[PDB]
């Protein structure tokens, strides 16, 4: 019943994989292990007595593309992918957040092993001292109570991602809560040229690209911004006549959308 919350985002598996980015293995390898080893090595968990953490904090500046990257790792998880948005808990009627949280743990607890990735948690994680964010403290602290008072919570993890760490909730420190705090800073022009190269490995890119002009123009940018430059290049490169990607299309897209 109540398919508006049960059927939030019914996705079997995505298309993109972890091999679409470049220059982040030193910080994403811990997450790739943290999603591969708790899926196949359940037998070795009894020999060593290891329980994987249920709360991972994938935080960083916005536009980094952490949603499509966590989904790219969710393709490697092989389980059912279930999105969820932050502002979805704020509803008109009272007690809806309890139905959304208990319904999410009703499908995760009752249903098959899946993967539930949420985003924009910082937009509702405000520690105010009536107020709507205090209602989000009722629902939020209810979720933390379901990640603190439940020892059978050894089931499917709860992955979270925040686009900003300005309002850092001090109560988010626990083995079951968001303990994995791996800092994801803004990628440099080298990493942006890597993710833009691997994301642009399908278009007919000219071989005479020294990455110096685009490396100079890309100043304090993000991942999804260079993805928008790649897509925009795939949009006007069609109407430019030449099927081969030119060199002016990078700065033309950067100055086009930004």
């Amino acid at each position: 019943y109540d398919s508006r919350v049960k059927a939030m985002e019914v996705d079997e598996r995505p298309t993109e994989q972890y091999s679409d980015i470049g220059g982040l293995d030193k910080q994403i390898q811990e997450l790739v292990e943290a999603i591969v080893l708790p899926m196949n090595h359940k037998e070795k968990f009894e020999n060593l007595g290891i329980q994987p953490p249920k709360g991972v904090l994938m935080y960083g500046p916005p536009g980094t593309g952490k949603t499509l990257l966590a989904r790219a790792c969710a393709a490697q998880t092989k389980a059912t992918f279930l999105k969820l948005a932050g502002p979805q808990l704020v509803q008109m009627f009272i007690g809806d957040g309890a139905k959304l949280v208990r319904d999410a743990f009703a499908l995760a607890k009752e249903k098959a092993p899946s993967i539930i990735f949420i985003d924009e948690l910082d937009a509702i994680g405000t520690k105010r001292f009536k107020a709507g964010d205090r209602e989000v403290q009722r629902t939020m602290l209810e979720l933390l109570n379901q990640l603190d008072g439940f020892q059978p919570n050894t089931q499917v993890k709860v992955i979270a991602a925040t686009n900003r760490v300005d309002i850092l909730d001090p109560a988010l420190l626990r083995s079951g809560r968001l303990d994995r705090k791996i800092e994801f800073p803004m990628p440099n022009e080298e990493a942006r040229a890597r993710i833009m190269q691997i994301h642009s490995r399908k278009m007919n890119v000219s071989p005479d690209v020294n990455y110096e002009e685009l490396a100079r123009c890309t100043d304090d940018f993000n991942g999804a911004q260079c993805k928008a430059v790649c897509v925009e290049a795939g949009m006007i490169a069609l109407r430019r006549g030449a099927t081969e990607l030119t060199h002016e299309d990078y700065m033309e897209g950067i100055l086009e959308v930004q």
């Binding site: 509803q91 008109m92 928008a228 925009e232 949009m235 069609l238 109407r239 099927t243």
Partner: protein
């Protein structure tokens, strides 16, 4: 519902001759409304896919004229247009089945094009509207019906933040259409050459240049009120010396307060 089949529209209307002075914009939208349908293989081989579409918004002015221009511009079969003022009714819920059955009929019409007018009437409590518009985003960004045919929204104000933040995923190429130029109004008169009988002595350039701030809708009202006063004149044909008082009266007496 009766509004679904009631909203079906197949009628000839404004052709391409009503380009409103926008030299570059009419190519920016013409290369996506005319070329992808005429050359399906050129955009698949020359690129990776044809472009998505444009986004006409801002000041209304002479709005809805370019929509009819797109309807009659198809050299094969006029497409269906959908306004957004039909979803705000009693007993909400018709939105889901409505968009699912018009997208299902879009699958039945061999990848036909569907236009969605007046997004401001369904965007910007409102949770019962959030279901239909967020589900609508799930039906646009979701490529199950199609993700390549056409994307275009028309709004009066940019106060719709959810479609503005969800539009960069699939929508693109936001443009503007405020008012035509001096050489355009004579072309709206050229499409009005098949209107009420206009004598050959009347010059379209003279009447076009003798009225500033005369967008296609305002001069459509000039032909409406001037047509009414030409009917009241009991004359076989219309002469500019007979309804010029209707022209400057309907543009100046209304231009005083507005």
């Amino acid at each position: 519902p009766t509004v679904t089949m009631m909203q079906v529209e197949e009628k000839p209307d404004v052709t391409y001759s009503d380009v409103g002075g926008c030299k570059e914009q009419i190519e920016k939208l013409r290369e996506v409304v005319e070329t992808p349908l005429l050359h399906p293989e050129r955009f698949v081989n020359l690129g990776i896919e044809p472009p998505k579409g444009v986004l006409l918004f801002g000041p209304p002015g002479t709005g809805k004229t370019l929509c009819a221009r797109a309807v009659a511009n198809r050299t094969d079969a006029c497409f269906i247009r959908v306004i957004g003022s039909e979803l705000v009714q009693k007993y909400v819920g018709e939105g889901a089945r409505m968009v699912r059955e018009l997208f299902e009929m879009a699958r039945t019409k061999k990848a036909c094009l569907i236009f969605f007018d007046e997004i401001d009437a369904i965007g910007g409590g409102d949770n019962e509207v959030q279901r239909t518009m967020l589900e609508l985003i799930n039906q646009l960004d979701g490529f199950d019906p199609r993700g390549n045919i056409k994307v275009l929204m028309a709004t009066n104000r940019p106060d719709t933040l959810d479609p503005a933040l969800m539009r960069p995923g699939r929508l693109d190429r936001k443009i503007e259409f405020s008012l035509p130029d001096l050489e355009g109004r004579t072309h709206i008169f050229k499409i009005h050459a098949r209107s009420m009988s206009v004598e050959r002595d009347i010059r379209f350039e003279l009447l076009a240049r003798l009225c500033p701030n005369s967008t296609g809708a305002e001069i459509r009202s000039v032909c409406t009120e001037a047509g009414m006063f030409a009917i009241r004149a009991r004359r076989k044909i219309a002469t500019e010396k007979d309804f010029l008082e209707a022209v400057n009266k309907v543009i100046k007496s209304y231009a005083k307060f507005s």
